[PDB]
């Protein structure tokens, strides 16, 4: 049905970037850390 589209973009930024992981461990989550998407609220009410 034609309705003038108003968009919403949900995007997530996984940045695993470990220090190779072949010398000691890859599944040890090194520099695994922040993976997040801009939509989080300080109150952090669920974003619908």
């Amino acid at each position: 049905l034609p309705v003038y589209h108003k968009h919403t973009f949900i995007v997530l930024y996984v940045d695993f970037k470990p220090q190779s992981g072949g010398g000691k461990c890859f599944n040890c989550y090194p520099a695994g850390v922040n993976i997040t998407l801009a939509n989080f609220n300080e109150t952090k009410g669920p974003l619908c």
Binding site: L1, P2, V3, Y4, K6
Partner: protein
């Protein structure tokens, strides 16, 4: 009826809903060629 968004008081229909002192603009999108009945 007219092309301009204001048009006359290519057909563009805008439905705008305002709550309290805030005014918002909405998009009609599809416009029927002919409507024979209306229900609410």
């Amino acid at each position: 009826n007219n092309t301009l968004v204001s048009g006359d008081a290519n057909f563009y229909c805008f439905v705008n809903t305002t709550i309290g002192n805030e005014t918002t603009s909405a998009f009609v999108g599809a416009l029927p060629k002919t409507v024979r009945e209306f229900v609410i």
